[PDB]
With several copies, the nearest count.
Chain A
Amino acid sequence: KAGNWLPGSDAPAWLPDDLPGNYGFDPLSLGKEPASLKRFTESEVIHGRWAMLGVAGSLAVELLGYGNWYDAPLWAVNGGKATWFGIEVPFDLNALLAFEFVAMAAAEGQRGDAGGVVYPGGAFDPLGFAKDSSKSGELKLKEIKNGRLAMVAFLGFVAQHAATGKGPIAALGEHLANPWGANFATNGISVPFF
């Protein structure tokens, strides 16, 4: 196992030991059924990968200086043009929905028709970092841990924005300037009685 989410508590019997990122965390027993646990595994891996890409993009835009993740689609609501890396994109919102819908429909349709494949390999791994399944167990643990961390980070991005109105980098700088005076307990939104 990867560890213990509750030091001293017995791990659930429905969680296999060879499962990556198995910390024995299942208080609600959601993955008790073997069929549900199989779907939950690929769902968590897909969510982790999407959240990793999303958090990386949200941090990259603010670090480079093109606004935050929330202000990015503000060009399509009131007379604006999309700018990727400071370069004007010649596509309107109507063309973006068609391209994205068709592309995502085709990709996700092939993925769904595959039959719940979590680790495809081959064309998706040109460098061959997981050619042998012996060392792939340790690399999968890093992927699931980074995915869970990125999921928590994206949830934190959404919550901190909905509570203050600033981007993740701006909130980090404000917290660094005043840690005790600028946190979730001082925004007047999270805890109403503070």
Chain B
Amino acid sequence: RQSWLPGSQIPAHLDTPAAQALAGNFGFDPLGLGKDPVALRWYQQAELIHCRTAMAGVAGILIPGLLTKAGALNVPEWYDAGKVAIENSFAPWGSLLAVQLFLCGFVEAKRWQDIRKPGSQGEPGSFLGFEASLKGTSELGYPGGPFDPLGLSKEADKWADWKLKEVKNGRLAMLAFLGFVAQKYATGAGPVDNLAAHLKDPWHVNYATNGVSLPFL
């Protein structure tokens, strides 16, 4: 049993067979927010969505940023790409955000109804015949059909491993984006610039010398 703190008392709500089936269960819940099974299920869905969104965003920030350091690309910084993209664009940010909110609200409402009732999106005669593929699998937050075209989820032997690689990576991405914000408010440069500046001199270029993270020193 892997634990987030060797020797600490793992909470009872995270030791049940239902909670142990979740990917990345390390018994980490000091505030006890997952004591309620319904709340735990809802938070599991929230964590999965956060993991996938953070992975996509951090990838979209790191890969183009790393390619910009070399001569492969010329993508601006993540904190300035919005203005540059909206300058030579066909629509203002408000109209684009409205269209985005409508398109995202439709799929988010369908996902919400599936969370409230699993497999309820497969109601016949409701989505032009595509409702048959809108039914998720036996595990909430892991649907098939149009999603997962390669069919890598059909093999159970690697399934338990695959989920472990999705949550963990996602958690790392969730921290990465957080760092991307903090560094932006502490150095004023991009993440690749901060990485290069730290690699040039780690004993003097870190958060202990930025003058913000340690105001008492």
A interface, CB within 8 angstroms of B? 3-4, 6-9, 27-30, 32-33, 35-36, 39-40, 180-181, 183-186, 191-194
Contact = CB atoms under 8 A, between A and B. Distances in A.
A32 B72 CA distance: 44
B117 A32 contact: no
Given A7-B131, A8-B114, A28 B149 contact: yes
Given A27-B149, A32-B132, A36-B132, A7 B95 contact: no
A8 B113 contact: yes
Please list the 5 inter-chain residue pairs (A to B) with the smallest Cβ-Cβ separation, ordered nearest first. A8-B120, A194-B94, A180-B91, A36-B129, A185-B98
A33 B128 CA distance: 12
24 contacts: A4-B123, A4-B126, A6-B113, A7-B110, A7-B120, A7-B121, A7-B127, A8-B113, A9-B113, A28-B133, A28-B145, A28-B146, A30-B145, A30-B146, A32-B132, A33-B129, A33-B132, A35-B124, A36-B129, A36-B131, A39-B128, A181-B95, A183-B95, A194-B93
A35 B131 CA distance: 11
A184 B146 contact: no
Nearest to B67: A193
B91 A181 contact: yes
A186 B132 contact: no
A30 B126 contact: no
Given A30-B133, A36-B132, A7 B97 contact: no
A183 B145 contact: no
Contacts of A40: 129
A27 B131 CA distance: 17
Contacts of A33: 124, 129, 132
Nearest to B133: A30
Given A28-B145, A29-B145, A7 B132 contact: no
A191 B94 contact: yes
Most chain B beta carbons < 10 A, residue from A8, A29, A33, A35: A8
A180 B72 contact: no
Most chain B beta carbons < 10 A, residue from A9, A30, A39, A185: A185
B76 interface: no
B50 to A, nearest CB: 24
B215 interface: no
A14 to B, nearest CB: 10
Nearest to B114: A8
Secondary structure of the A contact surface, majority rule: loop
Contact of A191 (B98, B126, B130, B133): B98
A112 to B, nearest CB: 13
B98 A7 contact: no
A7 B113 contact: yes
A7 B151 CA distance: 17
Contact of A39 (B98, B126, B129): B129
A4 B120 CA distance: 12
Contacts of A3: 126
B92 interface: yes
Contacts of B130: 30, 36
A8 B130 CA distance: 14
A194 B96 CA distance: 10
A124 B73 CA distance: 56
Interface string B75-119: 000000000000000111111111000000000001001101100
Given A36-B131, A180-B92, 18 more contacts: A4-B123, A7-B113, A7-B120, A7-B126, A28-B149, A29-B145, A30-B133, A33-B129, A36-B129, A36-B133, A183-B95, A183-B98, A185-B92, A185-B98, A192-B73, A193-B72, A194-B97, A194-B98
